[PDB]
Design a protein around this ligand. Structure first.
Ligand SMILES: Nc1ncnc2c1ncn2[C@@H]1O[C@H](COP(=O)(O)O)[C@@H](O)[C@H]1O
Length: 553
């Protein structure tokens, strides 16, 4: 008994605040994150490409340092501010947009004050001013935005690369490139049973940020020969950078397992929220909201020529504020432009007709599963799965249309139905509109999609922070740890391929949030209080006025 309540309260403290001043941070982090010697970077300097878009735009710390560098030179300092303005304007609602836009116009484009960029054609200045007033469109400034970046990305770029700031960046880079091992994290109670090992929470000792650790047991992998299936999930997760898919931050090995460190979703899975949450299912508004999100998620994966192939309740999780992210991408795969793929894989009941039939496809199955899941949310039960045997369900799918209980509204039916159309080439989404058409379904009346993608819409249910949304430890299974299997040289080569260590972007963001960046990066503030006496114990000319007062009365 003891054990459960323990790890439970433990986790809550960590999720709460941790250890007081040190927000989860180990009492010796400053050391864990001590920068390397400048010379230790020279190697890494040569490796990194001199690519503007890479160093100044994609890599948060990179960008930050670049901004920080710009802050010094007024001509740049103002370029940056300008970009930050447009970026805002381009998300500012219509009723306020014109008011906001005009301020930037008068601030940065004033023909009176110092000029913005070295060579700006007077045409495009006035040309923009006009187009503004009559109908303030999104891409109003794109002309200048493009020109601005063109400016920076040349000489002010080279300048930064050849600045101290860039050295500082190299240091930061070195840190992320450092080996990661068991030691980098703390462990906690498990959270669920994965396909290849337990998933438990974990904290980065040095930064104190929370993560999930998907463990995949080295042995259980060779037995099932699911070596690709692992590497696959990783390589994908690595590439992805969507708001609706869990980001991966680390990939490392232990004696027994390979690990994926993932965005810790505190609200648990939907399989929990539907079944073990009093009466089954969700009110319309709610189920809608999720589908709507999961929609964008799918959009994003598809926009990246990737098909999920495993949308279901086990694999939709919730964050602290109450948004969702698709997870477990073991089955996912990349669809080359202008091509199709055959593959009979998934979870029974959620696999689309053409899948079961072993037919070629692209993105169909996902939109199918969204139906299945949207159904399973409102209805409170799988539309096809009381325990039912294997083959029958497959048949039940191939031919038998869906049956509605009295919970579905007029429109709630129309969507689910269109998504559960057994004819792939006529199924909603797959018709030739991608997500665009699914979004345009009238069910999503009072939801502004542009905003939802920014996460600027409040979810109709905020989880209780003090709650743990999953089973207790001894209430979770464990398959027989079959012996009679020994790891051989050939496997190590793969383990090399797998454990990349820290993932650049997410690593960096962690650094920023946990404030380590700002706390550690800044140089020239500590110890800079100009000494009372010189090296030979003498006062300067003239002697510190406060010092005398400390030696007399
Ligand atoms: N990032 C995460 N945050 C919280 N729980 C998770 C996370 N990833 C997986 N789990 C839980 O562990 C189970 C097994 O992981 P998976 O096999 O990846 O779905 C899932 O069904 C979830 O309940």
């Amino acid at each position: 008994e003891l054990e459960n309540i323990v790890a439970n309260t433990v986790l809550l403290k960590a999720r709460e605040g941790g250890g007081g001043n040190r927000k989860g941070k180990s009492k010796k982090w400053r050391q864990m994150l001590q920068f390397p010697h400048i010379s230790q970077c020279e190697e890494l300097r040569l490796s990194l490409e001199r690519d503007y878009h890479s160093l100044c735009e994609r890599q948060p710390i990179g960008r930050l340092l670049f901004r920080e560098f710009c802050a010094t030179r007024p001509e740049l300092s103002r370029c940056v501010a300008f970009l930050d303005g447009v970026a805002e304007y381009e998300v500012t609602p219509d009723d306020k947009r014109k008011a906001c836009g005009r301020q930037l116009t008068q601030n940065f484009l004033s023909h009176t004050g110092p000029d913005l960029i070295p060579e700006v054609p007077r045409q495009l200045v006035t040309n923009c001013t006009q187009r503004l007033e009559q109908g303030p469109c999104k891409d109003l400034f794109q002309e200048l935005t493009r020109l601005t970046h063109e400016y920076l990305s040349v000489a002010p770029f080279a300048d930064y690369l050849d600045s101290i700031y860039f050295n500082r960046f190299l240091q930061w880079k070195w840190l992320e490139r450092q080996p990661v091992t068991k030691n980098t994290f703390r462990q906690y109670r498990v959270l669920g049973k994965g396909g290849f090992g337990e998933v438990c929470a974990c904290q980065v000792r040095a930064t104190g940020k929370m993560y999930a650790c998907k463990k995949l047991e080295k042995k259980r992998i060779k037995k099932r020969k699911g070596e690709a299936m692992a590497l696959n999930e990783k390589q994908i997760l690595e590439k992805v950078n969507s708001r609706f898919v869990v980001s991966l931050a680390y990939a490392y090995e232990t004696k027994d397992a390979l690990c994926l460190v993932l965005t810790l979703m505190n609200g648990g899975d939907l399989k929990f929220h539907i079944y073990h949450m009093g009466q089954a299912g969700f009110p319309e508004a709610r189920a809608v909201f999720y589908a709507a999100e999961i929609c964008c998620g799918l959009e994003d994966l598809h926009r990246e020529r990737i098909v999920y192939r495993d949308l279901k309740p086990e694999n939709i999780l919730l964050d602290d504020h109450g948004h969702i992210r698709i997870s477990d991408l073991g089955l996912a795969v990349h669809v080359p432009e202008g091509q199709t793929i055959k593959g009979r894989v998934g979870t029974v009941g959620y696999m689309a007709p053409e899948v079961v039939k072993n037919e070629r496809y692209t993105f169909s199955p996902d939109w199918w599963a969204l139906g299945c899941l949207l159904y399973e949310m409102i209805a409170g039960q799988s539309p096809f799965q009381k325990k039912i045997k294997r083959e029958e369900v497959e048949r039940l799918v191939k031919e038998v249309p869906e049956e509605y209980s009295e919970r579905f509204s007029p429109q709630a039916r129309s969507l689910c139905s269109q998504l559960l159309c057994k004819d792939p080439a006529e199924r909603l989404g797959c018709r030739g509109g991608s997500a665009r058409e699914v979004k345009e379904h009238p069910l999503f009346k009072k939801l502004n999609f542009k905003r939802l993608g920014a996460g600027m819409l409040e979810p109709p249910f905020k989880p209780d922070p003090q709650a743990i949304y999953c089973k207790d430890v001894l209430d979770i299974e464990q398959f027989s740890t079959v012996k009679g299997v020994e790891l051989e040289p050939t496997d190590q080569d793969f383990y090399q391929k797998f454990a990349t260590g820290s993932v650049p972007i997410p690593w960096q963001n962690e650094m920023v949030e946990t404030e380590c960046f700002q706390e550690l990066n800044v140089f020239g503030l500590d110890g800079s209080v100009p000494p009372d006496l010189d090296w030979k114990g003498q006062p300067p000319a003239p002697p510190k006025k406060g010092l005398l007062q400390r030696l007399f009365s």
